[PDB]
Point group: D2
Chain length 114, copies 4
């Protein structure tokens, strides 16, 4: 199934934050209405916050997360969870190797903000 | 029901990160086996990271998040989500006021690292 | 924080299914726009499906689960999770006693159908 | 990433329930210590419960859900969620066609029981 794609409410500010846990340099791209709105990169095996940014979901609400390492796309897993019918998290893990820890880049999207 | 309390695998490193979305200054405490292991403070209405750290779950694996604003305890909501039977997120939202957006301090715990 | 209340897309068919794990008779009421639309009762310590139904979320999309044991409300816990940005689960657990297993009545809501 | 595989606590009872939403007949197999422990089959486009059982998670606690329709393996999506650090849901969706609704068979695993 497709992973790393979330439909947010339209024209809504959200946070996006990326953590690294791999010997490979991670590149995280965040697309809004199918175009790149943000790019984060770094290399850590201790969960460094390689990027964090506030974006707007735009008229479609479509947000997509992609991850690559040395130009090779990582395998993604994802889901969304809502607490008390109000607080949203869209969660992404990624695997760039063979050990299947799926933490090589971890991305958290959250809304509402403010 | 209790919220903000999680049982991690014993002797396991995990990341804990907090964001703020309120006019009030957020105080986030993270307790491991009932001892304070991290404290974050800050203010933002734009999802700023007010703290991030790597901790160890110790012999008990018990992790608890508490949030307060100028001495007043915030009401908490929480859940844990596991992706591909491997990647763990423990998620906390908090309310410091009347609007019940539950984003005033937002805490994300993730493991495994490395 | 409020639990057992979910906003569905308007005018959408959803499944609702209740399970029992207690010596006490569980009464599960499912409200749509604040009026009872389905009621199930039963006693089981083996996860019996004490009822299942298809309902329509109506114009408001407001769906609420209530659980009691002979008129005494149970303590509820809940969350919503979305898989591949399509498949929705609204989840409820409840506690009717002192052991805090929170499984005494369990309710699963799922959409879309068909 | 692998989907429909969950590590439960060992030697622990869990409930498994399957729903159908497709013109294709769904067959769901539930495997415990890598052997089929339950098989459910049925056809519904209205969320009919096509089977439910209580099983023991065995030595490893590894539980696997597999879904097929007319002999063809369906594409799976899954996640686990834990409420108040106690109540566990393992959730499976599946796709047997081209519309990506992932509800064609829906499987819910829950524990603890009793
Ligand atoms: C009128 C006022 O300053 N109210 C704040 C409220 O911010 C407002 O923010 C709340 C604040 N209200 C005012 C008028 O200053 C006051 O009621 O305290 C709240 C916290 O108990 C404020 O909320 C937070 O809400 C604060 C609140 C914090 O306890 O303190 C009041 O005195 O901060 C705001 C910015 C939001 O993030 C809230 O979710 C958060 O709880 O809240 C309004 C929303 O209800 C609205 O955002 C106003 O613009 C804001 O001033
Ligand atoms: C031999 C080699 O170069 N392996 C890298 C692999 O890194 C190794 O991963 C191991 C654990 O699976 C150990 O940590 C080794 O010390 C390490 O060299 C690398 O894997 C990534 O980086 C490591 C540190 C972990 O975070 C992995 O989860 C992560 O996938 C991969 C990247 O594709 O390449 C080789 O296989
Ligand atoms: C002695 C008695 O009748 N107690 C009732 C509870 O049943 C016992 O619960 C304990 C755990 O607290 C244990 O399971 C015993 O075997 C039960 O007899 C009863 O608890 C409810 O039913 C249980 C079977 C269990 O599912 C529990 O989680 C659930 O809350 C409570 C509430 O109905 O009432 C007591 O009188
Ligand atoms: C023409 C036909 O019968 N096609 C079968 C699919 O049913 C149609 O699915 C489409 C969506 O792709 C749409 O709902 C049509 O009205 C159906 O007739 C069938 O899809 C499965 O059953 C559907 C009713 C729906 O639940 C869908 O999500 C599900 O995948 C597939 C099953 O492999 O077979 C087609 O031949
Ligand atoms: Ca890896
Ligand atoms: Ca890694
Ligand atoms: Ca607030
Ligand atoms: Ca706020
Ligand atoms: Ca109980
Ligand atoms: Ca019980
Ligand atoms: Ca389908
Ligand atoms: Ca379908």
């Amino acid at each position: 199934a497709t992973q790393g794609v979330f439909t947010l409410p339209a024209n809504t500010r959200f946070g996006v934050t990326a953590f690294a846990n791999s010997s490979g340099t991670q590149t995280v791209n965040v697309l809004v209405n199918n175009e790149t709105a943000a790019t984060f990169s770094g290399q850590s095996t201790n969960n460094a916050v390689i990027g964090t940014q506030v974006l707007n979901s735009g008229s479609s609400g479509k947000v997509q997360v992609q991850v690559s390492v040395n130009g090779r796309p990582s395998d993604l897993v994802s889901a969304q969870v809502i607490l008390t019918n109000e607080l949203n998290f869209a969660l992404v893990g990624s695997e760039d190797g063979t050990d299947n820890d799926y933490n090589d880049a971890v991305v958290v999207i959250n809304w509402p903000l403010g």
